[PDB]
Amino acid sequence: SDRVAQLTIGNSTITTQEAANIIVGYGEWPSYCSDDDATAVDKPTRPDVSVNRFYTLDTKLWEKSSKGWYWKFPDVLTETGVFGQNAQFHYLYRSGFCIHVQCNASKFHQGALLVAILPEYVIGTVAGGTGTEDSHPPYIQTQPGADGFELQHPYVLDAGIPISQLTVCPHQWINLRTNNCATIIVPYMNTLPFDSALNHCNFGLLVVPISPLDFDQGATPVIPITITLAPMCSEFAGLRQAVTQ
Amino acid sequence: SDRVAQLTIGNSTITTQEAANIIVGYGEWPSYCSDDDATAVDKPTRPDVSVNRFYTLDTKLWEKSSKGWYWKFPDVLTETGVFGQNAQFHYLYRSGFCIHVQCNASKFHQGALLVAILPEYVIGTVAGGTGTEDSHPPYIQTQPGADGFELQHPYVLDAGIPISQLTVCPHQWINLRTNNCATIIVPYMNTLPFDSALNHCNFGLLVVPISPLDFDQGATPVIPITITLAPMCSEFAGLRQAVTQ
Amino acid sequence: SDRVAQLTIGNSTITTQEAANIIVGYGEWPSYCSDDDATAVDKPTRPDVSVNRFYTLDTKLWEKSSKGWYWKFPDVLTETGVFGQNAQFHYLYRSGFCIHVQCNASKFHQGALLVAILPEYVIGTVAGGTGTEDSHPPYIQTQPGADGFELQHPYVLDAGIPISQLTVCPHQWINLRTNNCATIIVPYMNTLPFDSALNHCNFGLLVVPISPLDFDQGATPVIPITITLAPMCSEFAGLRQAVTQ
Amino acid sequence: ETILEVNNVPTNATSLMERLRFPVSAQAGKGELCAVFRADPGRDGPWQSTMLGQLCGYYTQWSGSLEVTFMFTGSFMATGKMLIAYTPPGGPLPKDR
Amino acid sequence: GDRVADMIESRALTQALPAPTGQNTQVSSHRLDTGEVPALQAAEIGASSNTSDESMIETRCVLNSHSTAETTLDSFFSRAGLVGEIDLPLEGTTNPSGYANWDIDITGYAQMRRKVELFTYMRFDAEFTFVACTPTGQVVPQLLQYMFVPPGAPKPESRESLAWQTATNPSVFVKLTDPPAQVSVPFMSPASAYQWFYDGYPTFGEHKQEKDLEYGACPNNMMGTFSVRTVGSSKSKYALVVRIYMRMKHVRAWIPRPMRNQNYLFKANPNYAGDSIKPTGTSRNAITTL
Amino acid sequence: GDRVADMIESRALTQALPAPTGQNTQVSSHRLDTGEVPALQAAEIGASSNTSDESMIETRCVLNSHSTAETTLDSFFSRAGLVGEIDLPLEGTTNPSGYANWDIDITGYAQMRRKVELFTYMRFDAEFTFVACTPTGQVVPQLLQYMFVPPGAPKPESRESLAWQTATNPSVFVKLTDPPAQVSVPFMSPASAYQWFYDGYPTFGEHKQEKDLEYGACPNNMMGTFSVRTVGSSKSKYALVVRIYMRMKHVRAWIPRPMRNQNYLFKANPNYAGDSIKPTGTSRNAITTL
Amino acid sequence: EIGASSNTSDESMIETRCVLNSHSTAETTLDSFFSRAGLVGEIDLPLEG
Amino acid sequence: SIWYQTNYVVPIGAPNTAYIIALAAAQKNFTMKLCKDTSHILQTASIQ
Ligand SMILES: *[C@@H]1O[C@H](CO)[C@@H](O[C@@H]2O[C@H](CO)[C@@H](O[C@@H]3O[C@H](CO[C@H]4O[C@H](CO[C@H]5O[C@H](CO)[C@@H](O)[C@H](O)[C@@H]5O[C@H]5O[C@H](CO)[C@@H](O)[C@H](O)[C@@H]5O)[C@@H](O)[C@H](O[C@H]5O[C@H](CO)[C@@H](O)[C@H](O)[C@@H]5O[C@H]5O[C@H](CO)[C@@H](O)[C@H](O)[C@@H]5O)[C@@H]4O)[C@@H](O)[C@H](O[C@H]4O[C@H](CO)[C@@H](O)[C@H](O)[C@@H]4O[C@H]4O[C@H](CO)[C@@H](O)[C@H](O)[C@@H]4O[C@H]4O[C@H](CO)[C@@H](O)[C@H](O)[C@@H]4O)[C@@H]3O)[C@H](O)[C@H]2NC(C)=O)[C@H](O)[C@H]1NC(C)=O
Ligand SMILES: *[C@@H]1O[C@H](CO)[C@@H](O[C@@H]2O[C@H](CO)[C@@H](O[C@@H]3O[C@H](CO[C@H]4O[C@H](CO[C@H]5O[C@H](CO)[C@@H](O)[C@H](O)[C@@H]5O[C@H]5O[C@H](CO)[C@@H](O)[C@H](O)[C@@H]5O)[C@@H](O)[C@H](O[C@H]5O[C@H](CO)[C@@H](O)[C@H](O)[C@@H]5O[C@H]5O[C@H](CO)[C@@H](O)[C@H](O)[C@@H]5O)[C@@H]4O)[C@@H](O)[C@H](O[C@H]4O[C@H](CO)[C@@H](O)[C@H](O)[C@@H]4O[C@H]4O[C@H](CO)[C@@H](O)[C@H](O)[C@@H]4O[C@H]4O[C@H](CO)[C@@H](O)[C@H](O)[C@@H]4O)[C@@H]3O)[C@H](O)[C@H]2NC(C)=O)[C@H](O)[C@H]1NC(C)=O
Ligand SMILES: *[C@@H]1O[C@H](CO)[C@@H](O[C@@H]2O[C@H](CO)[C@@H](O[C@@H]3O[C@H](CO[C@H]4O[C@H](CO[C@H]5O[C@H](CO)[C@@H](O)[C@H](O)[C@@H]5O[C@H]5O[C@H](CO)[C@@H](O)[C@H](O)[C@@H]5O)[C@@H](O)[C@H](O[C@H]5O[C@H](CO)[C@@H](O)[C@H](O)[C@@H]5O[C@H]5O[C@H](CO)[C@@H](O)[C@H](O)[C@@H]5O)[C@@H]4O)[C@@H](O)[C@H](O[C@H]4O[C@H](CO)[C@@H](O)[C@H](O)[C@@H]4O[C@H]4O[C@H](CO)[C@@H](O)[C@H](O)[C@@H]4O[C@H]4O[C@H](CO)[C@@H](O)[C@H](O)[C@@H]4O)[C@@H]3O)[C@H](O)[C@H]2NC(C)=O)[C@H](O)[C@H]1NC(C)=O
Ligand SMILES: CCO/N=C/c1ccc(OCC[C@@H](C)CCN2CCN(c3ccnc(N)c3)C2=O)cc1
Ligand SMILES: CCO/N=C/c1ccc(OCC[C@@H](C)CCN2CCN(c3ccnc(N)c3)C2=O)cc1
């Protein structure tokens, strides 16, 4: 009654029969902006079906020597579907997300992942190596899009913060002896109630193998990791022509 | 709701998630000596935490050609901890026992054990082979202590009684396809309500592989058997200086 | 009705028929730790008979030129009996003490003693004689055990405090024309409600002849002083393996 | 709950992710020591990675019981039993199980 | 006088139901039902299986009136079995002077010993009977004195001794023309049950090889010495045997245990033949035949 | 769930009466009475004698209105005594670079130490005051930073260190033209009382001669380090002293003990001079004179 | 792997006593952790430089 | 201290070396007091 689930929203459902449990980030569901909070005076659009779908984005192969990946949300979906068309026309934006990452393996493979969220995941550099040149990260390390980006130094998460206490932020583990998926429901976290969808990326989805993959030779050596996400309770405002960046 | 358990008493707990069930020996829990039964007229000591602990004693390796082992209780614990200090100071003694024997294996290993109790397990010898010389067993075969002792002829249990009807006495099986542990709760069985802890050994824990261990070569060849026991409702009387034997 | 007494606790009693009176140190009996005071969250052991006994420890001969002795409690009983076994297994400890010191003499001998308690009796040295070298006392002067230790300079009690105002602390006199024993009941005095029994010695029993022994030659020249003590309301916590020091 | 680094042995920059987890393996024997660590969040050691041990770095004195959770990340069909023993103070590093 | 809440807070699972007859078999029918299965048990629990007849086969209403009174302990043990034999020969080595001290150990013959070794602790009254005769079988006009020597009483050392005055010991004077002397004996042990098995030593101290003779010897079971002499100053002119039969009554037995399958070799120890460990049953050449 | 009667059956003698003034003396007369004697006490009981004035001498009615408020612990201890002195000289050996770490041990001066060593356990709040000046006495326009380093915080190692940023430590910035900086300090110890005497060792293990330095050192009493620097990157042009005065308030003291009579020699140990044990009083040539 | 901190208490792991915990949690609030004046800026106004 | 109680048994085809991740937190009776500055100072030079 906990191992088996089904998440239907929009026209797309996903079934899982070896889940762990759904955690709701910071204990509350995504919701619409109340009139106590809103400052924009134009009526928002709320598509309510066409953008609240599980978008399956990409597939990272996980071998025995991987480091970890990250996806900046919502810039994984400003190139995809009716979410990517409404977020490019409209200046303002708010939504929550239901984030579901699948990674199946046999009952002989082993290894654990820490799929975790963290809001305002800013990216530092190696500062020129020795630490004296103020190098800023490029635009693709900042906002990789639906392609994702691989961590260089996952012990410090490319930001000088340790991964050992990433477990404070909303997370759950995918260890291949127990579960194969990890649902994380995230509300809209930001100070101001709407923001731009092209500039500001509210959070980043860190997916790091902490305990590495291991399997005896003869088993299937290709163990993919696919993340599917669904913008919940999304609404846009401030209509103008299409910007792409 | 039966496969998973937890036995906490004292400051030590043991968890098991592939148990069979707890059997209570002869249908009753260990209890204190009532004033209808007691004959000693000094007030007993009852330590109630410091001696009601799961003492993990030893580790017998079980290979494909083993015979069986036995431990004489309570002489496995007259050398260990605050039980071994209270039983050496005090002449009288009574307690029950919660006896938990672990033996894990993979889902490819096979084999079954008969971990059984029997009260007043007296030990015979081979009578000089042909059966004409009255040989008595030595002190180490009689009371091996926490080291245990291996059975010579397990079909007759070194006492001329067959193991085929050992299943009368309180027992349960560890077959490695179903369970990995076997809890046996034993009350205090003896005629007189207290007795000496150094001379009289109330019962013996026979642990005999009946169906032998078997596994194809490549699996883990070291399959240990560890027994943990907890004196429940123990009380001592008759304080004097320390005897060791 | 005051000269004759009997102190039975545990399985051991002592009779006295020329006592003075029992004084209770600081006006209160030893008691168990209430739940307003306790901070440890494991259930304490309370042996209640096996450790609340009058342990007769040693015998100091008192001649005409003695200085005085001291015993650090409870380190006189961390080598003796079931108290010495429970205090070596358990980290925490609290108890009171009933301290009874016997010294009989004839009706022609004379002399007086000041058997007194004092809590936190720390020991200084002679500072290298002239008083310029920071010498610390050795471990045997600090904690002599059941053997006791003889005072070097009893006028300053080896601590720079005069014996003339030791009479503030709980005490009573053994002058050989009136009494032959001195019962001092001491509660548990320490800041924190339990402490270690191997490191911290709560108080010291100073037994100093102030008025010296005197007798004409022909009388019995051997006048012993034996101290017997009984831990009252003792309880231990924090079970681990045996430390001895 | 927050990742305590019991395996605080490796130090070079290419193997700092080795610290977060410590190995178990098929022993050929009886009761071997897997890992041992100090159980106090103030002392320099394993507890400096957890947020219990770094918010306690701002406070001089702490109290209360504290929990340690061990997640086994092996395969499905690999079983075993581990003994996780907390020794109270005074008692030294234990020599056998 | 406490403020703590730890001290102020500081039983059988089975009920003996009356069962005079074996239980009836109620009518069952077929069942085609998932979910519940009465056949598939778990024998690794260590419980005997509670599967009945009705949930395995279609049965009829059988009113079982078969009594279970023959199988009680008072009907299984109250049969006088041979537990001792005392020889009083005319000339020989074994008791040549017409007295014999037979210490009461009823584990000397393997039919009474085999039954009472099924249980560990037994508490019972007994009535002993002393059938005495010449070794050829015939009865002779000879007077005998049996007497019971408790632990501590003086053992009689000869026929014409002083301990046969029986000032406080119980004694029986029967001649052989009479019927066999039958006396009842109470439960005399200091413990609450005669334990047939005492895994332990009676005395403290170091336990070397010279004093392993005490192993298994409990003083709560050895209840004295039974002495018998031919009443007279002269020697009697008849060789004698005295067979001792005892039946147990008012029996309470505790803690069953496996029944002996190897031959008995000695008294008061379970020593068995080492090279001659025989199987507990008969055998056959193959398993797929009969 | 017990049938035993042993487990189911399993406090101060003195009452604090209010006494604002010393007690009155009621009128007594003579008494010529046998049987009862108020003079003859028994000092071997170990009790102070309860003999009053009235039962030794004919007294008058004296209404004693002498208050006992000056002798309470809050009036005996709430006086600011010198417990520390910190030197910040221009050039020298002892702190030549304008910082000083003085760990808070108030047993360094023998007037405040002598009073608070009367009691064993004391629990108190304190208000420290830091009177700072040039060694000639005059005040100079110099800015100082005091900061309190608890056990575990980084000790500042220089004047221009990073630990002087005081992100969480409490710190006081006062210049010497100002009045003395006075801050109040709570009861900070982990134990329930600052014990002035700890007969024991803090750590376990064997106790050899090399680590007898820990004897008498309790961690519940050492409460950190008080650090002071002249605020600036350059060196200050004024030699400085900082005298620290503390008075105790909200005082609770337990377990009195004899007051020191030998000279103090070191901090945190009662070591005394061995050849120079002086008597606790003055002396006279004979006992029968004055 | 749920991603929840464990709700196992003291009482269901070890035999415990009644401890009335009166240890206050007021020092750990945000208004007591942050209301300390820390050095956040330094401004130099030198004579010549 | 963490001790093997029986073993770590595997079938053929499973990896014979597994990894345990140790997570740690406090209970609900955990309190702290007397706030101070931390022991590590995360700065060496002037932060530019
Ligand atoms: C002029 O001149 C110049 C100079 O020379 C030249 O140049 C050149 O070029 C060429 C061309 O390109 C080249 O060659 C190439 O190479 C490549 C590479 O290699 C390298 O690298 C690798 C990598 O690694 C990785 O991975 C692994 C696993 O796999 C792991 O383990 C590791 O760790 C790593 O990881 C990493 O990375 C990743 C990525 O992804 C990530 O993720 C992670 O994170 C990490 O970081 C490596 O390994 C290698 O190494 C090597 O070396 C070393 C030394 O030191 C050693 O030790 C090792 O062992 C190795 O060796 C081996 O190997 C190799 C291979 O690799 C070989 O060759 C050798 O011999 C040996 O054996 C390196 O470094 C590669 O890849 C390639 O190969 C390919 O090709 C060939 C022909 O061509 C063949 O034969 C092979 O087989 C292969 O094939 C494959 O692949 C493909 C593509 O990919 C595919 O499609 C296919 O299908 C196949 O697959 C298959 O098979 C396999 C087996 O192998 C299996 O597994 C699977 O499943 C399937 O079935 C090539 O070779 C070169 O290099 C250069 N040079 C140099 C010097 O380098 C030029 O050219 C000229 N010009 C003209 C015009 O000519
Ligand atoms: C003078 O002279 C003299 C005369 O010679 C000499 O003497 C000598 O001495 C020496 C020294 O000591 C010796 O040698 C040695 O030996 C030993 C023994 O052997 C024997 O025994 C065995 C046993 O068995 C058992 O077990 C099994 C299993 O394992 C089973 O199956 C069976 O059944 C059994 O069981 C039983 O027992 C048990 C016990 O525990 C119980 O429990 C049960 O119940 C039962 O009862 C046996 O087996 C053997 O056998 C043999 O032989 C036969 C004939 O008949 C055959 O058939 C067989 O097969 C065998 O053979 C094989 O093996 C062997 C071995 O064993 C080899 O050698 C051969 O070659 C073949 O291969 C016998 O009888 C042993 O043990 C040893 O060995 C060792 O060492 C070596 C060198 O030194 C090496 O190389 C090896 O490898 C080994 O090593 C191992 O071990 C160790 C110890 O233990 C360890 O530590 C290590 O680590 C190792 O382990 C490893 O490996 C393995 C493989 O092997 C594996 O498995 C594992 O896992 C790991 O990895 C030695 O060799 C001898 O003996 C003697 N002699 C005679 C004749 O004997 C003297 O010395 C001189 N002097 C001078 C001065 O020099
Ligand atoms: C080489 O060379 C070297 C050099 O010389 C050598 O060395 C040597 O050695 C030796 C041997 O050891 C030695 O000898 C010895 O000595 C010893 C010691 O003496 C010393 O000391 C003492 C002590 O005192 C104490 O005590 C008292 C009482 O008693 C008191 O009074 C005091 O005060 C003191 O007190 C203190 O101490 C204590 C202890 O306990 C404490 O407690 C307290 O607190 C305090 O502090 C002393 O006294 C002495 O003195 C002396 O001297 C002086 C001079 O100045 C004078 O004045 C005096 O008077 C004295 O003298 C006298 O005495 C002596 C004795 O003592 C004599 O001898 C003389 O002659 C005179 O008379 C000193 O200083 C001792 O002890 C010893 O003696 C012993 O022995 C002998 C022989 O041997 C004998 O004869 C004697 O008698 C004795 O005996 C006794 O003892 C024992 C043991 O203890 C016993 O057991 C016995 O039994 C006896 O007892 C008895 O008797 C008695 C009488 O006496 C009585 O009382 C009782 O009761 C009983 O009956 C010895 O002598 C030496 O010294 C060294 N040297 C030098 C110089 O020193 C070497 O050896 C070489 N080598 C080789 C090889 O040879
Ligand atoms: C004129 C007077 O006539 N008197 C007759 C008469 C008859 C019998 C009698 O006492 C009968 C004692 C039996 C009832 C029980 C014998 N028992 C107890 C258990 N035990 C055991 C236990 C463990 N190991 C061994 N070897 C032996 C054993 O042998 C006393 C007096
Ligand atoms: C800007 C920030 O301004 N901060 C000022 C400031 C002032 C004081 C302060 O803490 C005062 C501590 C005292 C009240 C008690 C000192 N105590 C306790 C018992 N003890 C003992 C016990 C046994 N042996 C020895 N040697 C010594 C001892 O010395 C902290 C901070």
Side-chain angles (χ1 to χ4, degrees), chain F residues 200-211:
Chain F
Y201 295 93
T203 61
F204 282 98
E206 60 186 2
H207 299 289
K208 299 296 183 181
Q209 187 64 39
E210 295 302 320
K211 290 182 180 180

Side-chain angles (χ1 to χ4, degrees), chain A residues 63 65-67 150 221:
Chain A
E63 66 268 10
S65 66
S66 294
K67 297 290 178 68
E150 190 181 7

Side-chain angles (χ1 to χ4, degrees), chain E residues 58-75:
Chain E
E58 291 185 354
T59 60
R60 63 176 295 163
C61 181
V62 174
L63 297 176
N64 206 167
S65 67
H66 295 169
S67 178
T68 65
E70 188 72 25
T71 64
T72 55
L73 297 178
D74 291 332
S75 294

Side-chain angles (χ1 to χ4, degrees), chain F residues 104-107 124 126 128 130 146-148 170-172 183 185-186 188 194-197 216 221-223 226 246 267-268:
Chain F
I104 39 175
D105 61 356
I106 68 168
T107 63
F124 57 90
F128 283 77
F130 310 104
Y146 305 142
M147 71 179 289
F148 168 64
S171 72
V172 176
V183 292
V185 174
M188 295 186 296
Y194 300 114
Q195 47 191 351
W196 301 99
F197 278 141
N221 302 120
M222 48 188 73
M223 291 311 298
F226 176 78
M246 62 93 79
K267 292 190 263 75

Side-chain angles (χ1 to χ4, degrees), chain A residues 18 67 106-114 153-156 162-168 171 173 175-178 208-212, chain D residues 1-5 10 13-21 48-55 71-80:
Chain A
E18 201 168 0
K67 297 290 178 68
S106 174
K107 298 168 74 66
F108 285 168
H109 295 81
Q110 76 179 4
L113 287 77
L114 181 63
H153 298 93
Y155 186 77
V156 297
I163 196 169
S164 64
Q165 52 196 355
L166 182 65
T167 319
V168 176
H171 72 287
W173 298 82
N175 46 358
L176 303 174
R177 76 187 302 272
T178 297
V208 176
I210 289 175
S211 178
Chain D
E1 284 184 352
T2 296
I3 301 167
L4 177 66
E5 56 183 12
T14 181
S15 298
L16 289 174
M17 288 296 290
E18 301 288 326
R19 307 180 85 209
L20 298 176
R21 81 286 178 276
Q48 289 194 359
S49 66
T50 177
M51 191 170 282
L52 177 63
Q54 281 181 350
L55 289 177
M71 186 177 75
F72 178 69
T73 68
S75 63
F76 183 80
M77 291 182 69
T79 59

